Design a protein around this ligand. Sequence first.
Ligand SMILES: Nc1ncnc2c1ncn2[C@@H]1O[C@H](COP(=O)(O)OP(=O)(O)OP(=O)(O)O)[C@@H](O)[C@H]1O
Ligand SMILES: Nc1ncnc2c1ncn2[C@@H]1O[C@H](COP(=O)(O)OP(=O)(O)OP(=O)(O)O)[C@@H](O)[C@H]1O
Ligand SMILES: [Mg+2]
Ligand SMILES: [Mg+2]
Lengths: 405, 167, 34, 32, 383, 175, 285, 109, 348
Amino acid sequence: GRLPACVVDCGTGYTKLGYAGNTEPQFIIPSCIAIKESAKRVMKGVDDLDFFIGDEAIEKPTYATKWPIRHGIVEDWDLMERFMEQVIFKYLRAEPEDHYFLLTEPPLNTPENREYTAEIMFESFNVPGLYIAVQAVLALAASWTSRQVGERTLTGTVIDSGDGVTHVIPVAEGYVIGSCIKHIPIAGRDITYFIQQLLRDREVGIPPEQSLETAKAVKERYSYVCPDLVKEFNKYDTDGSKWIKQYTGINAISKKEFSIDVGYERFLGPEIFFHPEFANPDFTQPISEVVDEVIQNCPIDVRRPLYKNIVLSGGSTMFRDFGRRLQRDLKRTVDARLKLSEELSGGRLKPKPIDVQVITHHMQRYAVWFGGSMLASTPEFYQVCHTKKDYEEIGPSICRHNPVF
Amino acid sequence: TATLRPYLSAVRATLQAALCLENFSSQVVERHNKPEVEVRSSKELLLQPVTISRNEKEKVLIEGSINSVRVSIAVKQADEIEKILCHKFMRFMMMRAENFFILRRKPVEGYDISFLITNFHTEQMYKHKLVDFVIHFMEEIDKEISEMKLSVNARARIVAEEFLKNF
Amino acid sequence: SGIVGALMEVMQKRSKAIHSSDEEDFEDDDEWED
Amino acid sequence: SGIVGALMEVMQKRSKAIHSSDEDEDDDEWED
Amino acid sequence: MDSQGRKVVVCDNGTGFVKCGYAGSNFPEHIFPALVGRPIIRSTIKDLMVGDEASELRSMLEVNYPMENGIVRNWDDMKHLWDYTFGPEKLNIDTRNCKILLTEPPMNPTKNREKIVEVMFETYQFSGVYVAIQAVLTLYAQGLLTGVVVDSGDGVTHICPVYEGFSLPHLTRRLDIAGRDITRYLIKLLLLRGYAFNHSADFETVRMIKEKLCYVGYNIEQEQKLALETTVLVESYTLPDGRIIKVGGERFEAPEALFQPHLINVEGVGVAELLFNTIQAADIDTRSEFYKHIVLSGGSTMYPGLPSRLERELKQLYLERVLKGDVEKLSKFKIRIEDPPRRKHMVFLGGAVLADIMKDKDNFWMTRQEYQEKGVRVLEKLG
Amino acid sequence: PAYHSSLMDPDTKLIGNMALLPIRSQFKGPAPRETKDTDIVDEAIYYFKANVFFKNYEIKNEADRTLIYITLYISECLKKLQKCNSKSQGEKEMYTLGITNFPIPGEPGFPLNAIYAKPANKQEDEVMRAYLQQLRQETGLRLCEKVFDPQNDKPSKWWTCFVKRQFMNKSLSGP
Amino acid sequence: MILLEVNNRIIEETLALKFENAAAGNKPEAVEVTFADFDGVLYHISNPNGDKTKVMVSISLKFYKELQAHGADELLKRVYGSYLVNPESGYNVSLLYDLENLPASKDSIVHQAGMLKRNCFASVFEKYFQFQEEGKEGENRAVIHYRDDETMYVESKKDRVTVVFSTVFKDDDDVVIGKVFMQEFKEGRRASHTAPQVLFSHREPPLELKDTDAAVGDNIGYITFVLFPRHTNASARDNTINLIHTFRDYLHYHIKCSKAYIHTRMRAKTSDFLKVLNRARPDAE
Amino acid sequence: NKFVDEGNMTAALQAALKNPPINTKSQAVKDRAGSIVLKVLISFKANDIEKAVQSLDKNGVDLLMKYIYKGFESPSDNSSAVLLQWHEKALAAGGVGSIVRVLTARKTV
Amino acid sequence: MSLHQFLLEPITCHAWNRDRTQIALSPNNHEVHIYKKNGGQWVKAHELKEHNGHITGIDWAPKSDRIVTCGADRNAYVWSQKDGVWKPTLVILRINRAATFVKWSPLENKFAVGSGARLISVCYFESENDWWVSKHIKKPIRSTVLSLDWHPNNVLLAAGSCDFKCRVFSAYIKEVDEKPASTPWGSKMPFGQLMSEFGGSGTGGWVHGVSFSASGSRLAWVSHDSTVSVADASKSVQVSTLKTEFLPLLSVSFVSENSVVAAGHDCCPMLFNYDDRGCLTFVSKLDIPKQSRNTALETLHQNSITQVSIYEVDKQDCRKFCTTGIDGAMTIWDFKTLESSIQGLRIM
Ligand SMILES: Nc1ncnc2c1ncn2[C@@H]1O[C@H](COP(=O)(O)OP(=O)(O)OP(=O)(O)O)[C@@H](O)[C@H]1O
Ligand SMILES: Nc1ncnc2c1ncn2[C@@H]1O[C@H](COP(=O)(O)OP(=O)(O)OP(=O)(O)O)[C@@H](O)[C@H]1O
Ligand SMILES: [Mg+2]
Ligand SMILES: [Mg+2]
C-alpha cells in the first residue's frame, strides 16, 4: 500500500539511484550532463530540455559535457536542477508528490547548500518530505552486517575514498567531531593517471583516445596491494610467466584488436596511497599517519573505542589487501610512539597494549546508499523528515539543522 | 514612460533628502548601537513618514531617522500570473538577504519589498550610487516580470504544439 | 528506541540473509606479520 | 596607622573625587 | 619606591592573565596570559615556552594553566611563570631588594597561602611580602569601606559582601560560570552555523571573537524580533589565515548563559537571583547600605548592556518579592549599580593604593628576618 | 620509506664522507678484494627498481652516498643502453662510457654537493677518481648481463621503461 | 525530453542482463527488487521458491476490479500467452520467465514485458472503440478511479469517442500555470488541423457529465478529448492509446519544468543585481 | 521623562495659500483646509503652473510642497499626474531644502 | 585645492599642532594615528591605542602640547609626550552613556566633553594624586549634545543638542579660574547658569554645529532644518535666520567678524555674509568647477564633509582653512586664490 521512498546519492564520478528497501542500487550512472553547444543568452522555446545525462552524455557529437559536482560540492545549480529532472522523471519514473526523499551531503557542508537543495526540492518538485543525511553514520550503520550483535555501536573512524579526496571522519555516539576531520588529496582518479603514465612510458599500440578507459579497466581488473616492493619486483623479474598478464581491447574507429602486457602497474597503482610522493610532489604523509593524527586530536576518553572500530568505505578501497596493510602500518606507528614514550619516561609510563582492528565487509562499494536504504525502510523514518507544511509555515530555516536522534 | 519619468524623478529627489545619516549611540541602553527606525524608543530622533504614489496601486513609502532609512515599495501587479510571479520573485530575494546587506527578511504590511539602509552602509558605499541602485532596482523588476510572462506563454504554446502534432 | 533500535532490528533481520548468500594464488600469510 | 589612620582620610578624598554624584544625588557673590 | 630605595611591586595572578606593576600608578605595567606550553611536535624551537608568545603558537604546543582559582596546581610551572614575570623581558627587577603585594581569592585554604609565602621567601628572597583579599582591594579602588562586590573573572563568579573593611566569610556565594564557559558555549553555538573550531587549538580566535562582538540584550523579546526581520546583527570577522566568517544572532545568546545557567547544564539560579539572596540573607539594619553600594568587577563584566539588565532584574525581584503590591514604594528605595569603565583592573588599583599608603610603615610588611627565626608563624602577623 | 644499505662495518676506510666498500672486479683500482658473494653493486642493482620512484632520501651512514652514486650511474647507463642492438656493442659502449671524465664532488656539475664533502689533498682526489672509475666500470659490466634477453639479443622492455625517471629529481649529466 | 516514455526501464535492463548472462553460458544469480511507477503502481521481480533458474514479474494495481469488469484478462492472455501464470498473493498479474527454455531473438519479449502497465490500460479503450466501430449506441460509460481523487470517464457516441479527465492541482501556482497551459491546448486546432479536439472547464463539471459524484471545489479542472474515427480505426489505435494514458504526467512534468526555468532566470537576475551593487565601494573592487 | 513637544485662478491659489491653520488641534479644520487647497490644485491648468510657481516667496513654496506631499496619501483618479507635475515645477524653484523642511517638521499640515 | 588621500576609510575627526607640521586623526576604529610631514610627503609617525570603542573626539592643545581623546566606550584620556613616546592619563567622567564631543579651553586649563546622557562634563586637573576631575551641567538639557564651542574669555560655553535648541551656559570653576568681567550676554555668572536659549517655534532640526566669532559677541549655528542662524548679543540678543535650498550643513566657522564658512552633505563649502544691520545673505560656493557608468562628481570631495577648521593663524586673521570628509581626504583651501578664480567673491 505505502510506496517506498527514493534514495539518491550524488558523487563527483557516479550517482547511485534507487528505491528504499533494496540491497543494491538500481542505477549507477556517471555524474555528467551533455548540454547543447552555445555556438556564439535568452533560450527561446523549449531549449533547456534538450540535454542528456548519464552514459548517453559521454561522447555525443554537437553536445558539450559538463561536470556539475567538483570535489563533493555543487558548483552550478541550474545543471544540478536539470540533472535531478531527468533523475526523477526518466529513470526512477516516480511521481514526486507521493514519495519521500533521502539525499546525501559532503561531510563539510555549509547550511546555504542545504537551503538551496531544500529550495529546489520543495519549490520545483513539491515533495512531501525530505531528509538530508550525513554519509559517515550511514557507512558505520552499513558496517554492522559483518559484525555480530554485541559489537554494534556508533563510535568509530570512517575512511571514505573515491574520485575526489579521501576523508578521515571520526564519529562518536552518532555525532561527527567536525574539528578533527582531515583529508588526503590521493583518490581513485590519480591512480588512473599514474597507470596511464606507466602504460604510456612502457607499452606501445594503445590508441591515443582510448588510454583512459584501458587504464581504468586495468585498475579495476588486475590491481592489488603488495606487502613489500623489492620482493614483488624480484618476483616479477624471476618468474615472469605467472605474474605478467595480457589485456585485449577493440579499437573504436578501425574495429580491429590490440593486445598489451600488464606488468609492474598491478602493485604500483595503489602504492601511492601509502607513498603519495610517487605521483603528487606536494603531499608526503602516508594515510596511517593521518589516521593516527586524527585519532590523537580527539579527546582522551574516546581514543580507545576509535582505534577498535576503523571502518572502510568508498569505491577506491576495494583493492585486495587494504585493511591488513593499513592495520600493520597503524600498529607499527602506535608501537613506535609507545616505545618512545616508554624510553622517555624511564619506567614511569606502562600503558596497556591497545587493539587495532580494520573492518572489511561485503557491501563496501555502496555502503552509504545501503545505510540510507535501510534507514528509509524503517517505520520511524517519517517522523524525522521535514514536511512541506513546516516549510510553508515556518520557512526555509528548518533545514539548517537535522534531527539525527 | 508616460508617467514613469516624473514618478522616478520625484522618488529620486525624495531619496536624496532622506539619506543624510550619521553615527549615533543609544541613550537608553549603554554601549548599544541600533537603527532608530526599527527600535522607535525616542520620538525626537524620528522624521515624518512620506509617500509617493503614481496611481492607486503603485506607491513608495519612505521613513527616516537619525541613522536609518526604511523604504517600502509596492509593485504593479496587473494579471493573476503577474501576482504569483512577483510573489515568487520577492520571496526569492529575501532568502538570500545576507548577501544584499540592505534588504529586509520580511516586508512592511501592505507593501512588496523593503530596504533598510543604516549609517554603516553610507560609510562603506557612496550615497548617490545607492540612490541610483534603488532607481535601477525599481526599473528592472517590471522588465523581468514581463519577460517571464512572455517566456511562459511561448513555452506553453510549443508544448501544446508538440503533443497535438504527434497524434 | 527511536530510529536507532529499529535500525539494529532491520540490520539483524538482513544480516543472516546476506551471510547465507555467500555460502588460492594469494594464500601466503607469513609475509604479513611482523 | 594599622587599620584606622591615614587610610581613613585617603578613602574620604577618593570618595570625594570618584563618587561626586552624591553631592547631587537628588532630582552678593555674583552681584556683578 | 620607599625611603630606603626598595621598589614596591604589585602583582595580580589570575587564572587567565597576570597583571603586574608598581605602587602608586594608575595603570598596569604589563598584562600577559598565564600559561606554560610544551612542544607536542617532539611527541608526534624551545623545550620550555612561557608567556604571551606561548599563547601565540598555541596549536603547535600543548598548554597548562598553573593557577586555577587561586589554587596552585603545578608548582614547577608556577615557578617558571614567576621567573618569567620577574625577568628582563617584562619587569627587570632585582628581587633581593624589593617588596611585593600579592592577592588572594575568597575561601582559600591555609596550606596554599603557607606554601606561597614559603616560595616567595625562600626562592626569590624578597624583603617584604603581603597578601590581601581581592574584594577589600576592589572596594579600596572605588573609595568605599562597605559594599557588595560581584566579581566575574575567568574562574568562579563570586558575590561577596564586605562590611567596614572586613569581608564577611559566612555570607559569600559562588556561581560556576565564567569566560571559559562562555567561550565553550560560543564554540558550541558556532558549530551549528557551519564553522568548526577545535576546543584546544582554536581557543584564542573564539576568545577574540567573544571580546569583539558579544553583548547582553536588554529586552530578550526584542532582540530576536530584530534578528528575524533585519540583517543588521550579522557582522563579518576576518580570521588570521584569511577566511571571513559571519556571526549573526549568537552575539546575544552566549552571555544569556550568565543569567540562565541551565543552557550550559549548570544547576542553580542566575546571577541576579543569587545577588538578591545574598543581600537578603544578611541582617535587617544593614540591607539598605548593601543596596546602595554594589560594585561590579572582573573582565567578564565588560559585556555591553550588562548593568542595565542587572539593575532591571534586581528591581523586578525586589518589587515582586518584598513590596509585592505597590509600584509607588519602589521609587523611594535606592538601588545603585556602580559601573566605571576601568572596572577590568580594580584589584591592581586597590593593591596600588594600599601599597602606596603603607610603603613606610614597618609593622605592615613582614620581613625576611621574621620569617628566618620564626618560619610559618610570620603569617600570624597577617590577621 | 626508501631502502638503505646494510653493509656497514665498524672498521671501514672513510674516503671523504663516502665508504670504501670492497668489490669483486678484475679491473684495476684501489678498492679491496671482496670475498663474500654480496657487495654494494649487487645491492644497488637489487634496490634500483624500488628506489628510483622515491624523491625524499635520508642519509643514515656512509654507504648511502655510494648507493645513490651507483643508482644515478645505473640511470645514465640505461639512458645510453636504450639505443643498442647487440650485446657486444653494449660491452663496447659501456667501455666507452666508463672512462668518461664525469664530474666529482666539489666541482660544479655534481648535483648533490651540499650532502657530499669534497676532499682536501691531492692523493685523496686521485684515489677518489680511481675508485669512482672502478665502480663505474664494474656496474656497467654487471648491468650488461641483466638488461639483455638472451633469446632475442635486444634490450628488454622491462628495463628500458625507467629511462624518463630521475632519482631525487637529479641527474649525473647535463639536461 | 519533451514526451514521456511508455516502456519501464528497470524491467528492461534487469531482464536484458539476466537473458544475456543466461545465453552466454554462466550460472544465474538471485534477484529481488521492489519498485514503483506512476499512479501508485507497484512492481516486484523475484525468484519463485528460491529457484534461481526462473524469474517472475508481478504488478500491483489498486483498481484492478474496474479493469477486470471491462475484460482485461483476455487481452493479457492474448498478448503474453504462455508466460501468464497464477498471480502472487498481494499482486494482480504475474508473468514467469524460464532461463533454460528461452527463444533465440530475445528482443521482443523484453519489450512486451516492459509494457505491462500499458497493456493493463488497454482493454476499456479497445472495447469502446469497438463499440464506436460497430455502431451500437446507448451503452453505459466507464468510471475508472486511476488515482485517489482523480477519475477517468470514457463514453462512446455514434460518431465520436469522448474521454474526460479530472485532475487536481495541489499548489496554488499550479492552477494558474495549468490554466495558461490548457488555454494553449484549447486553441491548438488552428495550427494542426487533423487533431483530436481538446476542451477545458475549470471548477465545474461539463453538462454531459451529470448525476455523478463530480467535484465542485476550486482546484479541480476537467479536460475533454474528442476522438474521431480517423484516430479510432484499427491501424492507428495503439498509438492513440500510447498518447492517451500518459497525458496527466506529461502536463504536470511540463508545469514543473516551467517552475524550474523561472528559478534559473531569478538566479541570473540576482547575480546581476549583486554585481551591480558590488561596484559602489570606494577602491575595494 | 519622555520627549513632549510644546478666470482668476492665480488669485484663487493666492487666497488658498493664505490664512492656513497654524496651531489648532482640531483635525476637521486641517482636513477642510487640505481639501480646499487640493481642490484648487487638481483643477488647475497644465500650461501655466510655472507662472503660479514663480509668483511666490520661500514660505509659499514650502507650504505648497507640504500640501503636495500631503496630497499623495489619498490618491483618486488622474490627480497623481497633476501632483507630480506640480512637484517637478516646485522642485525647479525650491531646491532639496524644501523637502528637508517637509521631513523635519513637528507640526503637520 | 590640495587633496591628499590619507585612507580609504572615513576620518571621524582631525587635529593639528601649533606649527602645522603634524596631524592626528582617527581611521574609523579605536586608534589614533599621528602623521608627520618630512619634505613633501606624509609619513605615519605614531600610533596611540588605549580605547576599546569607537573614537569620537580628538583635540590638540597648541601651547602645552597635549592631546585629549574621547570615545564611545564612556572613557576619555589625555596624552602627553615623554622621551619620544606618548603616555596617557586618566579622566574620571562619571557618565553612563557615550561621549560625543571634546574641546579644549582657550587658556588650556579645562576641557569640555559633550555626551549622550543629557549633560556636559567640564574637566580640570588635580595633581595631588594625578588625574582630572569633572563637574556636570544637566538642566535644562533634554537630549544628546552634538557640538560645543568656547567663548574667548574662558568662561562661557555654547551647546547645541537634539532637542532643537542652542543654549549658552556659564562654565566658571572657582578653583582654576579668575573672576571675570561683564559681557553683553549677562552679568550674573555662577556655574551652570543658563545665559540664553535660542530655538524655533514648532519647526526645528537637530543643531549640528555652533561657533563664536572673534570678538565673542556673535554666535552662529547650523541645523538639520537646512537653516543657518546668527545671534547678536549686543543688539539686545536678536536672531537672524536663513533658509537655504540645499542639504543640511554639519560644520560652521567664523573666518572674520562678518563672514561664515559652512560645509556638509553637499561635498562643498559655502560662504555667507552677515552685515551690521542683521541680514544674513548667501554669497557663493567655494568649489566652483573648472569650465571645460563612472559618476565622477564635480566636487573635490567625493563624500560628506564633517569638519571645518582654520589652518592659518586664527579667527583674527584667516587666510587658509582645512576640511576632512567621509571619503578619506584632507583638503586645504586658500582665500587669495579663490578671489582671483571666482569673480564677485569678496571676503568681508
Ligand atoms: N574494485 C573496484 N570496483 C569498483 N570501483 C573501483 C574498484 N577499485 C577502484 N574503484 C574506483 O572506485 C571509483 C568509484 O568510487 P565511488 O563510487 O565511491 O565514488 P563517488 O561517487 O565519488 O563516491 P561518494 O558517494 O563517496 O562521493 C571509480 O573511480 C573506480 O575507478
Ligand atoms: N571586553 C571584554 N568583553 C568580554 N569578555 C572579556 C573582555 N575582555 C576580556 N574578557 C574575558 O574576561 C576574562 C579575563 O578576566 P580577568 O582578566 O579579570 O580574569 P582573571 O583575573 O584571570 O580571573 P580570576 O580572578 O577569576 O582568576 C577572559 O575570559 C577574557 O576572554
Ligand atoms: Mg566521492
Ligand atoms: Mg581576577
